[PDB]
Amino acid sequence: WELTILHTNDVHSRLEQTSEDSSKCVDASRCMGGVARLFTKVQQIRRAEPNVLLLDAGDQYQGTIWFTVYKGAEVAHFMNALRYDAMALGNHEFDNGVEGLIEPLLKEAKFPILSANIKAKGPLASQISGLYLPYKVLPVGDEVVGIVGYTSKETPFLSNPGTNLVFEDEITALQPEVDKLKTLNVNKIIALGHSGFEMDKLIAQKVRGVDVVVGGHSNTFLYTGNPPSKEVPAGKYPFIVTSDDGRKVPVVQAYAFGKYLGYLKIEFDERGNVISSHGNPILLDSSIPEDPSIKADINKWRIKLDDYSTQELGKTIVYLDGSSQSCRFRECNMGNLICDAMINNNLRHTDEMFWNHVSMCILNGGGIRSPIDERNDGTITWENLAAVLPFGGTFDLVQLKGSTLKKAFEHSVHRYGQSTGEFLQVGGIHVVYDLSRKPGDRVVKLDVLCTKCRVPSYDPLKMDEVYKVILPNFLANGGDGFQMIKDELLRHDSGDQDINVVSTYISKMKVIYPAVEGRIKFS
Ligand SMILES: COC(=O)c1ccc(CO/N=c2\ccn([C@@H]3O[C@H](COP(=O)(O)CP(=O)(O)O)[C@@H](O)[C@H]3O)c(=O)n2C)cc1
Ligand SMILES: [Zn+2]
Ligand SMILES: [Zn+2]
């Protein structure tokens, strides 16, 4: 018995077709993804295959002005229109709190929403009871397929789930629900969840009874053969994990931003064992046309969003590299732009006096969520900025010891090479790293633009000197494991809204040209 699993993860409010780097589509003839083009590929498959399951492994929430305005109503509407069969809750579905998930998404979704490891205590229990489930048993033809859900254990450290939601260990929560399914003679079990390629491999290995693991969160690109675009595969598709009980368990992911539709065809025997599986993510490129009905529906919704693009903030003569393969691995000019906006807006505050000379900046590269293209004649709109900075935080001012900053720089590359968001973009700092050294002893040079000097210049960081640094409030409060900043700072003040800072800066410069200058080097 064959089943075709179609799957998406980390769409991140990319309802419209986007450029190759998933930023605002300018050249419509070369644009990819979007729910309308996804509809066309799903329909084509459903026409040709009788046993199809369309599944989302989370993080449809957050990413573009679609989310800023509709707060999740666009997720329910366009997922309902695509006829999704099931969706696992991601960390980003709690970005607007529990009420921001319950009221627009859970109560309007037609498909089941799953998570077996989220438990609800207090008065939330009665309200959210049944609005999401640990599993769902689905009829597929004349057979039945069980889907168990999971959600990142780290969600309270990345989102706003509140204090009436406990996030259990994935494996501990999943095993009893998989066992319950097997006692109900549900022999075909998909584990659909949002925890990352690493936890997915672990779930395939340790959770007996699981046949397939469909995942997300790590934005993993898996491919068998020649990749169709710039994404480099982190392994074959499907990735095969040999479980402890000898079974071969396929693990799949479909990159992110609606760019690819994950496609896995599975051949099962009558006892629900996997004989074989094969597939590849389908690159949703311009060859596949956008479904006219979905496009005209997206366009009707798009009328409300057109007042953000209507206002041009400024112009850029350069590509604003806000990608994850640059901003989490090396110096990217988008981190440089954000830090120069942070420092400049603060310095124009002639009302204060304590932070009126701050010239140092640190910025978590994972906080930079999108690049910005320059082929619109340089034109930068609020809509573009909204995708680079969707968390709506502030730019806080902090007083740190040199040893505290040195520890933050060690932390910045302690587990380098995993697309980890803790890699820092700097301003008024020149750091050199030697990755061929033990984690914690990789900073080989660190110079900062001094302040106890009349004519600044980058001078060696002193371990016991005090520095005034501007950074996102997220870092100021210990986010990304930057607990040393929260534990060791000497003063912490709130600043202006991150998007209003960068927006005001660009309008004042009128033409920006951030570049890679040697702020971060490797030895
Ligand atoms: C309206 O407000 C929100 O939407 C709102 C959402 C959240 C908060 C609290 O969390 N704030 C964070 C959380 C994470 N990060 C960054 O994201 C990285 C994780 O990204 P990925 O590895 O790509 C996994 P993902 O797909 O789930 O994002 C972290 O490593 C870190 O570098 C942040 O910068 N911030 C500011 C507050 C508000
Ligand atoms: Zn995501
Ligand atoms: Zn996530």
Of 398, 382, 369, 336, the closest CA to residue 500 belongs to 382
User: Partners of 132 in the beta sheet?
Assistant: 129
In angstroms, the CA 186 to CA 356 distance is: 65
Q: Token digits for 221?
A: 């690109």
Name residues whose C-beta falls within 8 Å of residue 269's C-beta, 6 or more positions apart in sequence.
1, 275
Q: Using the mean position of ligand 2's atoms as its centre, give its distance from the Cα of residue 10 in Å.
A: 4
Residue to mutate (ligand 1; options 59, 71, 474, 485; most atoms within 8 A of CB): 474
Sheet architecture: strand order including 239-242? 135-140, 143-151, 189-194, 212-214, 248-252, 239-242
This structure was determined by X-ray
CATH number of 300-522: 3.90.780.10
Q: Using the mean position of ligand 3's atoms as its centre, give its distance from the Cα of residue 10 in Å.
A: 7
- Residue range 2-299 forms a domain whose CATH class is alpha beta
Give the containing element (helix H, strand E) for 149. Answer: strand 143-151
Q: In whole angstroms, how large is the CA radius of gyration of the chain?
A: 24
Within 10 angstroms of residue 460's Cβ, the number of other Cβ atoms is 13
Helix, strand, coil percentages for the chain (3-state, nearest 5): 30, 25, 45
Within 10 angstroms of residue 487's Cβ, the number of other Cβ atoms is 10
Contact 53, 138 (CB under 8 A): yes
In angstroms, the CA 187 to CA 184 distance is: 9
Residue type, 238: P
Task: Look up residue 164 and give its DSSP letter.
Answer: S
Contact 379, 512 (CB under 8 A): no
Contact 195, 170 (CB under 8 A): yes
Residue that is written with structure tokens 């994972």 in the block: 366
Residue 364: CB within 6 Å of ligand 1? Answer: yes
Question: Which own/partner pairs from 183-187 qualify as long-range (CB within 8 Å, at least 24 positions apart)?
Answer: 184/137, 186/137, 186/144, 186/145, 186/146, 186/272, 187/271, 187/272, 187/273
Task: Look up residue 320 and give its DSSP letter.
Answer: B
Q: Where are the domains of the chain?
A: 2-299, 300-522
Within 10 angstroms of residue 412's Cβ, the number of other Cβ atoms is 24
Q: Enumerate the H helices of 82-153 as residue ranges.
A: 99-101, 124-128
Angle formed at CA 196 by CA 190 and CA 201, multiple of 5 degrees: 60
In angstroms, the CA 56 to CA 267 distance is: 21
Q: Token digits for 249?
A: 């368990």
Residue 16: CB within 6 Å of ligand 1? Answer: no
Q: Token digits for 185?
A: 């003679």
What is the three-class DSSP state of 140? strand
In angstroms, the CA 233 to CA 133 distance is: 32
Residue that is written with structure tokens 């206002």 in the block: 311
Burial state string for 376-400 with b = 16 or more CB within 10 A and e = fewer than 16: bebbbbbbbbbbbbbbebbbbbbbb
Pairing of strands 239-242, 248-252: antiparallel
